[PDB]
Write a protein that binds this ligand. Structure first.
Ligand code: HEM
Ligand code: HEM
Ligand SMILES: CNCC#Cc1cc(F)cc(CCc2cc(C)cc(N)n2)c1
Ligand SMILES: CNCC#Cc1cc(F)cc(CCc2cc(C)cc(N)n2)c1
Ligand SMILES: C[C@H](O)[C@H](O)[C@H]1CNc2nc(N)[nH]c(=O)c2N1
Ligand SMILES: C[C@H](O)[C@H](O)[C@H]1CNc2nc(N)[nH]c(=O)c2N1
Ligand SMILES: [Cl-]
Ligand SMILES: [Cl-]
Ligand SMILES: [Gd]
Ligand SMILES: [Gd]
Ligand SMILES: [Zn+2]
Ligand SMILES: [Zn+2]
Lengths: 404, 404
């Protein structure tokens, strides 16, 4: 049982949950790959044992493990798989798995919220325009005039044979990525590839730096067809700075809903390739990674020129000074527009509070240090000096290949 | 069969084939990762194969692998372990082995410099008094009036018959930390214990925040003896801010030379428990860690307060703003005083060049992401977006238990 120490207070705990599940990760005694983004790369006899496990702790979590419906719900499942080969989850199991996957996501820092998750059952889906309205209800519910609410909508579980539901966008709201005469980009370069497939399926492009891409949705077998998003529905915040009057004139906006639409939800040994979850942003994701990264909008030196910073030497810390202000403008703009947002300090302190909660409840908590520590001011936040264990529990959100 | 490592800023791909000959195993398993742990751990025949591996290494580097001179040295070493249970490194083998141990140090971002290491051979050392003067000369050569040089002094190897030479101090230069009436700490809280020791070994303590500690030096089988560093040997730097002139009224100072003194150097199976080494500082170690860590000097709030930042709420990002200016003051103070120093932008940039040199040469480079990435402004640096394989090669610097 790993001795996990916190170097700031001195506290000692043991992660006893690290032993309680496996799905083997990347590291071996001869090298750790914890810093890698994808763990390497991406007859149903024990679909039962994955469902045996899930149902077993579902009843553990409501006391009623032991007799009654517990030793009874074990039978409906094994009977269902006996003659069907797959099975259906009771609607509360779906809600409980949906929340457990969140609780288990090692890379997520906002898990203090894991128990407030709105779960839209959409397994009754089978059409493209159908999904699109399920998405569009999600977006309106989650966005909620800028008082954001965690939400996931679960689309039908991939069945043995016959296709999958899949969203071709990384997120519901993504900006345009337009190449040109330079092989360079105006817009967002993370999404250059999907702008390829948007136009390749009938999308007429647009202006430039901030074009909200169209959803590319596909229902089993039938190929993907595009879908446009109502501008009345994609809520967005224009970026301004409380004291640098010129920041607004840079014409920067970012959207409000972080909703990732390409991961695969696994509950009780069923795989849901369409399961968009949605929360609210931590400020650094917008200010530091999305805007400041050299392979994203890369605004850093442009903001530094406007601040009159000495860009002639790295020891001026001009990159650091401008990054902070970019972050200040993000929090400020979202607060003016009354859009839910959290700063990395507030966020990390809540994760520390979560770690304590999980300590008494499950004797531990899987966490990926390199994703929990914010991409600026890391050592200034209480999670930096806190050791962390990373493992794979189920239910969980996983990565999956793209449809090409 | 080797890990694929991606740079995400740029999209570079290589495979770390060097990790295959990892000469010892670490703390991770496929069940769970412990890469963020600070301390993972805490006869003639293996000593033969270790030493065999080093000799092979040493002779490849002088491009004379598998010569008579090479088979002579192998046959010599086993002959001497037969007779005595140990062997002796030739001076050239010692220099190479100290270089490689630096080269292999996965948590050092300074490794671009690994070939330019001044190795002082102190293996003929005899007393704890001789020990003191080998160290003073080390400090003098490495300090070099502010124009810092990298250096290591190797005291005699561990061997059966007598005990170890040991330097008790974690670093050659450290400031005292005094417990208090308030239960608090005056000075550096990282050094309360070594301060407790010095007092009870006769040192009459001061009552400042920046009192340089004496050396507790241990000759084999003797108790440790106290030695005062000559003041004019310890180059110090008063910290000033280039545009916040009230900063100099804080009294803050740091020393020029970081000289790590409590690590074990291991070469071809032989162990040097006393082999202190020194380089120059990266500004973040002083500014962020030593000065801003809440369990260290903890100046952040008092600086932010003087800056007239809004301390009531974190969304103002006061912590980040105070931190950046504390760093700017360190880089400025050290450049004013003509004392070598490197900022985290230059340091991570040269470490990326090292990674590229090291992939062409050895086919990989062991590195601990959580330590390579600076404690502020991570994603502003190019090491953030670089995947890294962590593993342990020999020769090596290892931790060892405190001798008390
Ligand atoms: C409501 C507040 C939330 C916050 C502040 C938050 C924040 C974050 C952050 C900051 C990261 C990774 C760091 C980065 O990529 O920049 C992350 C990752 C993640 N979060 Fe959360 N999130 C929230 C809600 C949710 C919800 C509701 C779910 C699912 C039900 C979720 C699941 C995940 C997953 C799966 C990842 C991993 C992404 C990947 O591996 O690519 N999060 N989250
Ligand atoms: C000359 C410039 C050097 C620089 C700029 C440098 C920088 C650093 C930094 C910043 C860290 C730790 C990161 C942190 O804790 O904040 C580190 C760790 C380390 N360095 Fe270097 N270093 C230098 C020279 C050397 C030399 C000369 C050696 C030995 C020959 C060395 C060996 C090590 C080792 C073993 C560690 C790990 C210490 C531990 O595990 O606790 N470095 N270095
Ligand atoms: C190569 N790595 C780059 C990347 C990435 C990434 C992709 C995504 F689709 C979502 C997020 C952020 C995830 C997130 C999710 C939620 C629910 C909230 C939040 N604040 N961030 C990051
Ligand atoms: C709990 N973790 C906090 C920390 C730390 C730290 C630990 C160490 F053992 C050495 C150094 C300083 C390392 C160093 C050595 C040299 C020679 C140069 C340099 N710039 N830094 C920092
Ligand atoms: C707990 C945490 O992993 C540990 O304190 C490490 C993390 N990485 C670090 N990285 C640097 N550069 N300096 C540090 O002190 C630390 N501390
Ligand atoms: C190479 C590195 O591990 C990788 O880029 C990780 C590191 N930390 C991150 N942190 C955040 N917030 N987002 C990321 O995509 C990453 N990526
Ligand atoms: Cl994003
Ligand atoms: Cl230090
Ligand atoms: Gd101007
Ligand atoms: Gd001033
Ligand atoms: Zn690992
Ligand atoms: Zn620290």
């Amino acid at each position: 049982f790993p001795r996990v120490k916190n170097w700031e207070v001195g506290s000692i705990t043991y992660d006893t949950l690290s032993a309680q599940a496996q799905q083997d990760g990347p590291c071996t005694p001869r090298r750790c790959l914890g810093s890698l983004v994808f763990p390497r790369k991406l007859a149903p006899e024990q679909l039962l044992s994955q469902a045996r496990d899930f149902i077993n702790q579902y009843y553990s979590s409501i006391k009623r493990s032991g007799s009654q419906a517990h030793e009874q719900r074990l039978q409906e499942v094994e009977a269902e798989v006996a003659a069907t080969g797959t099975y259906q989850l009771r609607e509360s199991e779906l809600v409980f798995g949906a929340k457990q996957a969140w609780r288990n996501a090692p890379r997520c820092v906002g898990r203090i919220q894991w128990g407030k998750l709105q779960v839209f059952d959409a397994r009754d889906c089978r059409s493209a325009q159908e999904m699109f309205t399920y998405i569009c209800n999600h977006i309106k519910y989650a966005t909620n005039r800028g008082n954001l609410r965690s939400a996931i909508t679960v689309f039908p579980q991939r069945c043995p044979g016959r296709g999958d539901f899949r969203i071709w966008n990384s997120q519901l709201v993504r900006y345009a990525g337009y190449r040109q005469q330079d092989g360079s980009v105006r817009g967002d370069p993370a999404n250059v590839e999907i702008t390829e497939l948007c136009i390749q399926h009938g999308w007429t492009p647009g202006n430039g730096r901030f074009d909200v891409l169209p959803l590319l949705l596909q229902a089993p077998d039938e190929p993907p067809e595009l879908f446009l998003l109502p501008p009345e529905l994609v809520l967005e915040v224009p970026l301004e700075h409380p004291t640098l009057e010129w920041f607004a004139a840079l014409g920067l906006r970012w959207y409000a809903l972080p909703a990732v639409s390409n991961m695969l939800l696994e509950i009780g040994g069923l795989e849901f390739p369409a399961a968009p979850f949605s929360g609210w942003y931590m400020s650094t994701e917008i200010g530091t990674r999305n805007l400041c990264d050299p392979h994203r909008y890369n605004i850093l030196e442009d903001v530094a020129v406007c601040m009159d910073l000495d860009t002639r030497t790295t020891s001026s810390l001009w990159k650091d000074k401008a990054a902070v202000e970019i972050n200040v403008a993000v929090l400020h703009s979202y607060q003016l527009a009354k859009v839910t947002i959290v700063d990395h300090h507030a966020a990390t302190a809540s994760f520390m509070k979560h770690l304590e909660n999980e300590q008494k409840a499950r004797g531990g908590c899987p966490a990926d240090w390199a994703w929990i520590v914010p991409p600026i001011s890391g050592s200034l936040t209480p999670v930096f000096h806190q050791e962390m264990v990373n493992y794979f529990l189920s239910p969980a959100f996983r990565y999956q290949p793209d449809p090409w």
